[PDB]
Design a protein around this ligand. Sequence first.
Ligand SMILES: [Mg+2]
Ligand SMILES: [Mg+2]
Length: 155
Amino acid sequence: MLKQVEIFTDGSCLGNPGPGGYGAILRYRGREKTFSAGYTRTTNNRMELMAAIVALEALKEHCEVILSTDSQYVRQGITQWIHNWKKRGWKTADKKPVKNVDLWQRLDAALGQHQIKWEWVKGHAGHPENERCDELARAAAMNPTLEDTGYQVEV
Ligand SMILES: [Mg+2]
Ligand SMILES: [Mg+2]
């Protein structure tokens, strides 16, 4: 029996690129734990990944994780893209580098540590933990303290 935990994630960004942040909630037994940090120039999609990465890397043993997010980008990557990446060596079909490969690879490493059941959510409405993660992410985007060193500036 693996430890059973719940993770909720969201990203937020004031531009594209602009200041942004991530928010994550990790719930196990009774102890609830929040994660957030703000970055001076990033994208929403990079913050969506960081939220999952940071919450997963926090786990210090093999767990059964229920991971809830409304990110259509993470969903597309998890369910549509990463299988192609793993047989093409993390390049596109045209042999080009994959966008955000630094975070996708880091997320995939953390994903391999646990038994993940993904819960895709249509929207914040009717999901209080996912809306709290948006609040956490937005709060960090309004008070950025770090640089997103992996963001390759597209502008
Ligand atoms: Mg989001
Ligand atoms: Mg958001």
